[PDB]
Amino acid sequence: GLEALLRPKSIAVIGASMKPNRAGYLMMRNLLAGGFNGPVLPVTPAWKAVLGVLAWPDIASLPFTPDLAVLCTNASRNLALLEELGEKGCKTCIILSAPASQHEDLRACALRHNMRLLGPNSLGLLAPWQGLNASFSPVPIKRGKLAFISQSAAVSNTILDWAQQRKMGFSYFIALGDSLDIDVDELLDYLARDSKTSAILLYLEQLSDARRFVSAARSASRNKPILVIKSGRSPAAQRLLNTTAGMDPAWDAAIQRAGLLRVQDTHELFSAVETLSHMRPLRGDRLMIISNGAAPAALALDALWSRNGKLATLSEATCQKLRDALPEHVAISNPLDLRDDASSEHYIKTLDILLHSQDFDALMVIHSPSAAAPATESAQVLIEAVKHHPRSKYVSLLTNWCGEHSSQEARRLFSEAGLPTYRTPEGTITAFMHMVEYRRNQKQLRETPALPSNLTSNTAEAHLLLQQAIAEGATSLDTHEVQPILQAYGMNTLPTWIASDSTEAVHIAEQIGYPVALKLRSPDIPHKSEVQGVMLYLRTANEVQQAANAIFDRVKMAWPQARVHGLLVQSMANRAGAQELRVVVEHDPVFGPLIMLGEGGVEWRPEDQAVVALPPLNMNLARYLVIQGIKSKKIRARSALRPLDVAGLSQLLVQVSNLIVDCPEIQRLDIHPLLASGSEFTALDVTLDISPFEGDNESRLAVRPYPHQLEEWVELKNGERCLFRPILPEDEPQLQQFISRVTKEDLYYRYFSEINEFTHEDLANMTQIDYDREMAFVAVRRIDQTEEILGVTRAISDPDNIDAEFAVLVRSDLKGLGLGRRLMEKLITYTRDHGLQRLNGITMPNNRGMVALARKLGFNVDIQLEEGIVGLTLNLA
Template sequence: MSQRGLEALLRPKSIAVIGASEKPERAGFLMMRNLLDGGFNGPILPVTPIHKAVSGVLAYANIASLPITPDLAILCTHDRRNLTLLEDLGTRGCKAVIILSAATEQFPELKACAQRHHMRLLGPNSLGLLAPWQGLNASFSPVPIKKGRLAFISQSAAVANTILDWAQQREVGFSYFIALGDSLDIDVDDLLDFLARDGKTSAIMLYIEHISDARRFLSASRSASRNKPILVVKSGRSQRAQQLLNGQQGLDAAYDAAIQRAGLLRVQDTHELFSAVETLSHMHPLRGERLLIVSNGAAPAAMALDELISRNGKLATLSDSTQSALSAALPPFVSLRNPIDLRDDASAERYLAALKPLLDSTDYDALLLIHSPSAAAPGSKTAELLISAIRQHPRGKRITLLTNWCGEYSSQDARRLFTEAGIPTYRTPEGAITAFMHMVEYRRNQKQLKETPALPVGLTANTAHVHQLIRQALAEGTTQLDTHEVQPILEAYGLSMLPTWIASDSVEAVHIAEQLGYPVAIKLRSPDIAHKSEVQGVMLYLRTAMEVQRAADDILDRVKRTYPQARIDGLLVQSMANRAGAQELRIAVEQDAIFGPLIMLGEGGIEWHHETQAAVALPPLNMALARYLIIQAVKGGKIRNRGSLQALDIPGLSRLLVLVSNLILDCPEISRLDIHPVLASGSEFTLLDVSMQLAPVTGDPQARLAIRPYPHELEQTVVLKDGSACLFRPILPEDEPLLKLFIDQVTKEDLYYRYFSEINEFSHDDLANMTQIDYDREMAFVLCAKLRQGRKSLVLHALSPILTI
């Protein structure tokens, strides 16, 4: 994404305050005061025709009279002057502007002016920004903030002010604190790209209300989250809340899917937001998921354990050597099982005796210390002893430590000591576990995204035939296809459908049933009735000619009485599928206003609400991503094993989902697809009823997708000097094993000249970063040839340099 002008905004060398004032109630006064108090080490240039000096700084009558061209300008005047001032700043060569307020009707002209002069805009209606490492407080906030490693980006001024106030009391520091306002130009994705490369930022927190460009957001988020944890608070879960925020309405489950796909972690509420800020500010990165709990009471330890189990956390198991060391240090009545209960009479010295052998242990990945108010172990004294021991121990800086000093009055000083020592501290056991699980879930998300997908078997499709069928349907004015019409399209993608025949009346239905063999099913065929259940338009298990004739006549009669204006295109006749022991599923594709096509998976046999009864994923899917969608549906209760005699074949269903994903990618005219039900019986998946909606495509067909798919158009067959044909193509995630094989054959000298350092071995993460690329912002090519021994390809050519666009 474009980084033009962001250096001038976030690391300015000079700042002009347009509309600086000596009147305390004016924005220009507040901005000058905050810039001067913040300690900005560069020229601050107040511009005002009224005063000769503002806050003791020489003022200038207009922009033209400035002695230097400022990197950053802040508009603090009445919004009616915005356009004129912006034009003057552009003419002068200013690179970035913060607009504190502007009317909505000004937005198009402001944006056009900024683009014409190659300026970047923050806002309008932005609170401003703070960059403590630069001594920069270009905001309305009078609250000074400490230097830290956490960057915070907010689309809400109210939330930003709340976090600032809370952070001051908790002494939480920030690298950047940015309030976006209306994001006329600079948006979240621009800032994520900048912060991903910023050496002062180690973690990022986002508060978002809407996403204006899904593809840019996902691209920037995925790139940044590979190196730095990013937590997201997204408000507006309900449609009414979205209306209140004046945001474009999108499915909340789609936001969940997008956030997870990008490798971010979503927190649910303000309480979790504060815990997350504490965690990101102080906690060391996790190397695993095993948690060890030490407490001076069974009850708080039990509360922590309950929360850990409810969130699918993992409890550490202590080795014999660690238990022996603890046994020698602690009284015999202290249980050495995790959680370790030091008892309510535990002194500060007993805490210290337990901590010392644990600092030498590698049996856990994170340690939670819980302390309940106790006369035997005053909170502050215990905290001081533990902090001192941690600082003096060689592994103290590498231990992932969390603390929960319960209570309020007697624990305030202890929590302050932990905060000053850079150790995360929480008020409740559940809050500490929630914070720990945030980092665990983030780690799991990253691990899942980097898993090497399996090569799917037999994913062939006759796309030319499908495109012809779709073009023909649209040319005839047909936009709604039923099971019979969809059948050749799906079969061209290798999807197994139950044969379907069309009958014009009951007589023909009987004739078809006789040919198919009983039992059969009969279904209404009408483009005007979306839900056949409204007219009892589906009749199953018809075993005789008389039953077929009666059922067909009854369906047609009910439609004529209930919907006399509805068009009837006959009846669909199918052999009755064997449902005994089979599981009914539903797969659908819907269009989201923000993220484009969504693939949904849920349980069949019910009229579902996809907002709550379906697991959601963004295309494109590979086998690994399809598998995660299935696991998410099962764990979330969207698919229940009701009456099924065989376990769900996850690889088989994954393959089916990948085929659906490929169909949607190849055919942008498909705006909606509903496969219901899908009968899953062991490794067999039969599609019984399908509807498809078509719409002509205008513009770039790829623009509708939130994630750019594999660019097939870049593939090219090349002939080598020996006459052998090879495929030159972009790299795929599935190429990781072949890439490793290729690198293993390269000499160390070649690797050194390729990467300018000595590399003994490439880890899975290294290879995943090379193969799982974002085709929107980088590209790597491989040259592949078939081996004589089999069909597998061998990577023959080194990766091209990855280019950031």
């Protein structure tokens, strides 16, 4: 648990000192200036009191056991001091520095004593809502709603400096170190469930395992917005930070899959700080601009034109009302009101009329200082106008006072009122487009797979084709051998022939019809481009003879004993009007299998043109990949006389995904060229690199599919039919009504040694699930083409796979029918099969039905006095 870290009751500072040049000095001073509500205990034999607080000589002399310990002493003593703490019985410790070794001994000690470590080389922790400042930083912070996580101590200090100088308030501020024991995935759950947090910010430099990162981020992304920034993109940056290099395009794919957003530099980062706070969520994507000058708005438009933004169109009634406010303003005929010497009176006369309509979703006000309209007065007038209007709740506001010297007070007043403000134009447009893109991506996230009948045994035949190949010892196959495997999955391939020498080669080429393409087959060297036998636009046989003989003599000269089993030759179709593509499937070691698409030619450089994605795929994901690739001009749409059809390409990609996920023996696949001719798609040359063995065939992925084999039909006690099945994201509406007609007593659960009761956010969170560590079943009824929920059950498992917590909810007017018992039996089966030890829960004593059911099971029920909670324990053996 993380409650002894994010909510301690007592703290012991080991290494507290009266020397101002020490970290213990700064830690004590920061801790005593925060507003903490517990004791701070300095431990040192070199003083009798530190900053006015009585000190203790050693850990064993402490009057009681603390919750949190901070080690400000040197690294040499680390391993000893930890041991002492283990004897005392403390729960968590923060370590200042380590010499890059003894990580093994540190982890062993922590596991032995059941202790949690905040990574060494960590700047610390700040919790303003508890008045906690267990940190080494020199700048203060304020209460707020924004949580931040950082990785490097240099990064942590740089970012907190930039932040405090940006002044923005915070909810949490955690600086990880080597992430030896506590990692990002664990923190994400706590932060998502927190109530003071409204957005989350990350700064990542490296990761240990991306599967759990993606899973937890996916789970937590439906509550609040989440943003990222990464910096390992150039070789010098890679070497200075000591990180691996060749996985950058996969990071974009993972970020897209988790539903998060990426920012480029730190200049857009303080815009991100300004927009995550002070800005309310949007309801659309229509923008209205007003200003007292032509150029600024113009500079904005270009920016909005480079990100494909949407403008607003004014109604004729609003246009008429705006007229008569002042003449010589043609700007009534465009979504950018324009003035040159306007006063604040015109500003208010425009604001009041504009706010009354239903024409846009966000308003952008630009001011260039002028004699007619001073900055401070305009700011005050705008603030009051926004205050007194009743429609201001349904509109987003953006401001831009463009005078640095003369607009400091106006900006301070805006910040006090809680209004966003930006230094320059197209810094507002960047934030607006950021938010629009976030809303769209969150619109398209909801997706999970479904498999109607899995696959038949015919693919097993295909499987045998590989088995014998690995029995034969072969590790790579060619098109001629690979044809049946592709055919089994619905792929189309062209036929090819093999000739032992030139004579038969031409003897068959004359039959199939010139032109004709040639190639070799030599297992030793995969670089057939070294030979480059491709031939086109010719029909004479002598050229074929000379080319074949030259290739034969060359391969003999390089190595006469090199094995050659023939020469591959194929016919040509009407490729002049055809389009060339290229497809690759690789095995990245951070994310697992990966699918990349691009164009043909030796120009292939994956970091440049490859558009990349993660399996598995369905039609929608493939369509989105194709659209993204085309729009970014990575792939041309009309390279030929005809357009490109996207349905066929998406279907081909789905087939590829099915094939690679089903068969794990494949390690690499390359289709080059891929011939796209209108509605038809065909493969010209295909290469497979395969390896034997596989452990589980599922852990190798990052996202796991929907378990349709648990879906059940059950006839109730009274002969009624219903369906028991796992939960889906689409059940959120149904879940909100079902919670109304449920008794209050059963709505309690235990979270972090506290008792709370379910709310709507809890159910919405419950809909977004990974079916590995958390499970939920629903019982559903079908009436008149609607689904109505009767009962829910949930189970959550711990990281070490030794405990779990369960909860059950049933609707009113449904009691006594055994529904709860059936759900509990279904949960017991699944949990015992998963491999857990025991199951824990709680309920009220006044509620007799649940305790009666638990007794019927015969599993332990304990009763807590003075609190009124009954604990249920079910040992699965």
